[model samples]
Target: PRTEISDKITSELVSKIGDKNWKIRKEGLDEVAGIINDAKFIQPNIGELPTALKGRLNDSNKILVQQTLNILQQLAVAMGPNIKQHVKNLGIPIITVLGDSKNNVRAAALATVNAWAEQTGMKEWLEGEDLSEELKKENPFLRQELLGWLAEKLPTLRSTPTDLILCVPHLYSCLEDRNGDVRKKAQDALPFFMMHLGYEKMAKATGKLKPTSKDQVLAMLEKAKVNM
Candidate 1:
């Protein structure tokens, strides 16, 4: 059942999210998260809650930041298409969380990015970020993560042609990644691009690549050229 809280209490709860006691703040966030899980419960009071959650993105406590993201994820599910409006407010903080030293925080942040990407065009969110540069990072972990995210993101890009076009080069180069897993993930993701661009278009785009093994590259190229 969706429990309804009065406007005054809701406002109080939003304010309590900033309380110095982390426990109180967590409780406040937990309450808001539950409340927002019901779309009807939140529609009336959406404005204040996101404003508060956006503010809490910088909270000193990592757990608080983590839980705040949990609530944002909940909001994303409950709000549906309306979630796009809040994506801009939620974008930078989650991107910052991707750099956090804690793996759990980064994982949660990535999940949220996946959720948002499922709902909105990531074109503006990722524009000019030089994903290929990140792919070149000495840190294999980050490279694996980007390649994995690309795999997850490609299917969503079918309708987002502009971003799909922008992503193709980075993904094609990832097939040559030094890390085996990253290379495989990039290769796996190729079919998604192929599904959107079709054989001739995809083969032409990826044809000039210098992949490690011609076997896999030739397979995808041949597959792309074949009649489906």
Candidate 2:
């Protein structure tokens, strides 16, 4: 069912992905990406992806991790429903990885997640039972992770009112997170905060817009991040 040359090329591609010189590995991964849109070509390599990406996550070279996140993000989509099962096992970690890495990776991962989630209804599928359980979970770790994802998503929500309206309960909670970073992120995301959710709720919760400048809200948000 597979060609020998394809196997050789796949091996060569994966092997040098972590090479010391990032250009070589980056170019190689980019080439691999070119073929992924073909389902037949990608299905066989699917099994290799998570493992190869696992190693890249820890690559001391930021460039390697950066490139790897881009490809994995593409894989997340190309694999589509195929990636649903692994979302719980790999979702948060990969998101966290992209968040912690360079901004380009963060942007790419955010776009990819939005595309994938829109098609899969990942949150919609979370439904009543799991969402309720998550909200009250004893483990602060899980709650915080959930909050972080929500915080990361606020900017996107701003542009999509329906999604923002649905996320109100969580967004309300985000304003009060114990973690300064989370609070700061919430702060950084205020325009979306105000536009969709409106000043009424914000005034009720946070009280008065103390700053009136065009950039005032974002400025306060950044300050909150540092103070958080």
Candidate 3:
């Protein structure tokens, strides 16, 4: 079922990835990114390209960074669920790009993560301890990005009821964020969580509910009639 592009073509493209000229590198990635869109072209070679693109995510040139992120995003979508294998390699760089000062880079980076989650259901990048630790750090933009991710992801998580129960409280506090966009996102995800947890319980979770952790939420979920 493999689509047969020649080794020569593949080798040429791979070599161009490391070209000194940024335009050449972008063109090379652009070609490979397009090739991967065909199921037949996705192979070990395709897998290796992202690791190469990882370095560009930090490039001082915004066009290089943005284009590279676009290529990576294209590859993620083309490869579908196969992207799970690349998550560890992609996660850190994707997170770094999400914190980019440029809105385009962050927007593209967030879309890529959403594509990964849509294909793999791995919410760790959004809900994990590392991200939680980041919430305690200095960048409010990253926090807003996190809220956007949560808003975008929460609605798709009906099967992930445990994560919903655990993360809704965090969403509650986001409603108090200074950024209107962040607060709006949190407000958007609120109803979805409420649908699963019930208006009364979600109201409590948003209000005086004392359940402080996942275990506590899980315990409550076990006793309550969760719609999910």
Candidate 4:
């Protein structure tokens, strides 16, 4: 059932993605998104496209990197759960850039993975267990970014995924992170978990918070209730 590799995602196109000229990279990204939009499934020989697209995320041009990730997101949508196979390939690159200076790049990268995770469901995070240790990593900024992503996504879920509560201790640890930014982000994100799991469970969970973290997080939970 393998189809012909589209002209837009061919080896030449991958090569063009990192060309010295921004125009070439721009053209490659735009064309690649087009091919992903049209394709029913990924082809074999063109498997390098994910790696190639990940490369430009480190490009000097932030706008080019943002455009490049739109193609990656499209590829994730095209493959659906099939994209799960490539996350080991794309994982570090995507996580490493979550702390990128450009807001545009980070937002697009988050969306790109959301495309993959939405289709694949929680296997990428829960059973496959790719992201929980991220809560304890040394990069406070990246840790905060992951918490920020969690803050945005947790409330939107209909029910708990397996073992997700096990990760809360890690989030609790972040409540006292060395970076004030991370501590604040972790506290703010705590309320959304309440949304996912409900007040009684989260009330028990947050009860374990440090004396300092306790008031701040309870206030946040109260704020979420009052505001919503």
Index of the highest-lDDT prediction: 4
TM values, all candidates: 0.60, 0.49, 0.63, 0.66
- The alpha-carbon lDDT assigned to residue 17 of candidate 3 equals 74
Ranking by lDDT: 4, 1, 3, 2
lDDT of 2 by residue, 1-228 (tens): 321123535666777665677777677767766666444223323544455566666666676666666666666566655556555545434544433435565565555556556545554423234343443333334344445555555455323444344344444454455756555655555554565456555445433323443244434444444432
Candidates 2 and 3 compared: the better one by TM-score is: 3
As for model 3, its CA RMSD to the true structure in angstroms is 6.3
Q: What is the lDDT of candidate 2?
A: 0.51
lDDT for model 1, please. Answer: 0.65
Summarize candidate 3's per-residue lDDT along 26-46 as a digit string, tens digits.
Answer: 888677656666553343345
Q: For residues 1-228, write the lDDT of model 1, one tens digit per residue.
A: 333333534668877887888888888888876666643433323646766777777778888888988877776666555566766565545655555557887798788877777666666455544444455454555655666776676566534554355556566656666778767777666776676667666656655566544446657667645534
Best by TM-score: 4
- Model with the higher lDDT, candidate 3 or 4: 4
User: Candidate 2 clashing pairs?
Assistant: 180-228
Q: Which ranges in model 2 have alpha carbons more than 4 Å from their true place?
A: 1-9, 38-45, 123-181, 184-228
Q: In candidate 1, where is summed lDDT lowest over 10 consecutive residues?
A: 38-47
- Tens-digit lDDT string for candidate 4 (115-210): 767866644555334576666576776777888878877766644655567667677777778989888888778777666666656557777777
Error of 1 at 14 (Å): 6.9
Error of 1 at 169 (Å): 3.0
